[PDB]
Amino acid sequence: SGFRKMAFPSGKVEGCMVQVTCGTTTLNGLWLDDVVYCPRHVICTSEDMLNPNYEDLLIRKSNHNFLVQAGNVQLRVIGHSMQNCVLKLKVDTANPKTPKYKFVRIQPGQTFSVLACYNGSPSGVYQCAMRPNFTIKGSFLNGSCGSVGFNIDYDCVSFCYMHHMELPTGVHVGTDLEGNFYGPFVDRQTAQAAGTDTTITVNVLAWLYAAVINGDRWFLNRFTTTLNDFNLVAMKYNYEPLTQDHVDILGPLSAQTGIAVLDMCASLKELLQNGMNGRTILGSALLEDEFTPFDVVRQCS
Amino acid sequence: SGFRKMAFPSGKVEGCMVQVTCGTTTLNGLWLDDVVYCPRHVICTSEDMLNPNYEDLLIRKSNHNFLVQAGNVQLRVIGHSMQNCVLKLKVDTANPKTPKYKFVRIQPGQTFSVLACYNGSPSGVYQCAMRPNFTIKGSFLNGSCGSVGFNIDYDCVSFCYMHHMELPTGVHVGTDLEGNFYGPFVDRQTAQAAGTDTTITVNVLAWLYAAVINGDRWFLNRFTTTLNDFNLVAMKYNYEPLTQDHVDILGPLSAQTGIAVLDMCASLKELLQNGMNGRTILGSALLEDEFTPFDVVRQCSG
Ligand SMILES: *C(=N)[C@H](C[C@@H]1CCNC1=O)NC(=O)[C@@H]1[C@@H]2[C@H](CN1C(=O)[C@@H](NC(=O)C(F)(F)F)C(C)(C)C)C2(C)C
Ligand SMILES: *C(=N)[C@H](C[C@@H]1CCNC1=O)NC(=O)[C@@H]1[C@@H]2[C@H](CN1C(=O)[C@@H](NC(=O)C(F)(F)F)C(C)(C)C)C2(C)C
C-alpha cells in the first residue's frame, strides 16, 4: 500500500551527464556515444541573451571554444552543429556508459522524471507532468540548463526533454532532444506567456482509482453518467473533455477495482459540483492531475 | 524557482541492489564489499511469519540455502549471521560498484530517499520523512522488503533505512542497517500500532521559508511572537514544541530571506489559529512538514 510521486531510478542517465563551458557560460550536456547535446544558449554572453542571432554567434565559435568535462577528464570537441535549439558537439570519445536509448516527443498530460544537474553533476530527481499549455512545474536554479527529462522501459532510456528557461510565472520550458520547443516559446530573454492551463481529467481519474485501491471510498456511489454529460460539466471547471481513448487507457484500473470508468466520472462530476466537504483523498485536500494511468498501474499492481 | 519533493540521484545505490532467495521467499539485499544485508524474514515461510522463532529457523539454514543474484551473476554465499532483524551474507566477491558509504541511524523529523526494488531490480525513487511516531508514509508492494533509504553527502552514501513491513494503518516500518527497528515494532505478522503522530514544526517553518523564496507572501504578517507564546499554541494543535536547536537550524533560511524565525513563527501561529480558509501555499491546501531546513537550503540556494 501507499501512493507516492515516484521518479524512475536515475543511474543510467547519471552516467551521461557532462559539464559544457563556452567562454564564461557553463551548463549541462548529455553525452550519448560520441555526441554531447546541450542548449545552444551556452554560446551566449549575458548580453547576447536579450536578442540573440544564434547563427551569427555560432559562426564565431571554433571547436576549441567548447570546454567539455566528464568528471575530471576533458573531452576534445572535433565537430559541432546546431539542430533547432540544441547544439550537438561531436567528441573524440564515445561514452562507455551509454545506455540503450531513443529520442521521443511526449504529449500533454504525460509524465517524465527530471534529473536536475549543476556543472554536469546530478543533484536531484523528481517527476513532472507536461502541462496542457506545454509548461512543467519543476525546480530549477541557475546553471540547471541541459538537465534532461526521461522515462525508462526495462533497460531503454527514452529522453523526452531538455531544460532551457523559466517563465515569469515560475513555471519551466524546454525542448525535445532534437531542439524543438514544447509550446510557443523561443530561447530569448524576453517576456513570454504560456496559454491558460487546464486540469488533466484522465490523470485525476487515474488518481481517484489509486485512492480506491488504497482504501478511500467515501466519494463512491451508484450514480453513472454518459461521456457527453460528464464533459458538459467538466468543462465548466476548466477540466479537459474525456475522450474514448482516455476511457480505454483507464480500462486496466477499472478492471482491477471493479469500478466502471463512467462510474468514476460520475464521482468526479459530484466532487467538482459539491467540493470535498472538509475531507481528504490520499492525504490531499485538492484533486491531483500529475499521475497518468500508467503511473498508477506501475505503483498499484 | 520551483519547489518540488526531490529525491537524491539513485545510481550509487542501484549498483548495490541484489536478489536474495531462501527456499521459496524472495526479497532484495544490499551488496557492499563482500557482504549482502537483507531482512531476516527471508528465512520464513508465510506460516512462520505469523509467529517466528528466528533462531530455530536460522539453525536449519546453511550457506547454500541462500541464492544471491546480482543481475544474472550468481554470487557464492560463504558465510551467514543474524544481527538483530538483518541477515548478513558473506559472499566470495567484493562488489566493484561499492560506493563510499556509512551506516547512520536517523532521528525523527529527518528525510531520506527510498529506492524501491522488486526481485533485486530498482523500480522507483521517492523521498520520505521519518515521522515522530517512527513510521514512514511510503509506497511498497509485496517483495519490496530489502529496499533501502539513504542520503548522499557529495560522493558518500549514508544508508539509514531497510524496509521490513506495513502497519494496519497503511504506513511503513523498518530498521537501520544494523537491524534495529525504528520504533516499537517486531518483525512478526501480528497487529501492531505506532504512537500518536505529531507535526514536525521545524519542517513546517522550513517549507514556509521555501514558499516566501518562491514568491508566496500572503501569509506574512507585521507581527512577531516569543518562543513560549508560539509553543503554547503549538501544543494545542498537536505541533512539536520549537527548541533553540531548531531555531539555530532555521538560521540560514532566515539569513537568505531576511525574515526572522520568530516573525515566521507569528505567521504559523495565525495559520493555525485562523486556519488556511481554503487558501494555498506552494500549491498545497495543507501545511507541509516533510521537508527539513536542509532540504529547503539544498533546493533554494545550492
Ligand atoms: C538555464 N541554465 C537557465 C535556467 C533558468 C535560470 C533560473 N531558473 C531557470 O530555470 N536558463 C536561462 O537563464 C534562460 C536563458 C536566458 C534567460 N533565461 C531564462 O530562463 C529567463 N526566462 C526568460 O527569458 C523567459 F521568461 F522567456 F522564459 C529568466 C528570466 C532568467 C528566468 C536564455 C538564453 C533564454
Ligand atoms: C516485504 N516484502 C513485505 C512488505 C509489505 C507487503 C505489503 N506492504 C509492505 O510493506 N513485508 C511483509 O510481508 C511483512 C513480513 C511478514 C508480514 N509482513 C507485513 O508487512 C504485514 N504487516 C504486519 O504484520 C504488521 F502489521 F505487523 F506490520 C502485512 C499484513 C503483510 C502487510 C513479516 C515477517 C512481518
Author numbering:
A (entry chain B): 1 to 301
B (entry chain A): 1 to 302
The publication says:
Severe acute respiratory syndrome coronavirus 2 (SARS-CoV-2) encodes a main protease (Mpro, nsp5, 3CLpro) that is essential for virus replication. Mpro cleaves coronavirus polyprotein 1a and 1ab at 11 junctions with a conserved Gln residue at the P1 site, a feature with no known human analogs. The essential function in coronavirus replication, together with the absence of closely related homologs in humans, identifies Mpro as an attractive antiviral drug target. The SARS-CoV-2 Mpro inhibitor, nirmatrelvir, was found and developed as the oral COVID-19 treatment Paxlovid (nirmatrelvir/ritonavir).
The crystal structures of the Mpro mutants with the greatest reductions in susceptibility to nirmatrelvir were determined in the presence or absence of nirmatrelvir, including S144A, A173V, A173V+T304I, T21I+S144A+T304I, T21I+T304I, and L50F+T304I. Single mutations T304I, T21I, L50F, and T135I had minimum impact on nirmatrelvir Ki values, while the S144A and A173V mutations led to 46- or 16-fold increases in Ki over WT enzyme, respectively. Crystal structures of A173V and the A173V+T304I double-mutant Mpro with nirmatrelvir did not display any major binding conformation differences. Because the S144A and A173V mutations each led to significant Ki increases, these two Mpro mutants were further analyzed by isothermal titration calorimetry (ITC). The KD values obtained for nirmatrelvir to the A173V and S144A mutations were significantly higher than that of WT Mpro, with titration curves summarized in fig. The ITC experiment showed that the binding potency loss in the A173V mutant compared to WT is due to an entropic effect, while the binding potency loss in the S144A mutation is primarily due to changes in the enthalpic contribution to binding. The A173V and S144A mutant enzymes were also affected, with 5.7- and 3.9-fold reductions in kcat/KM, respectively.
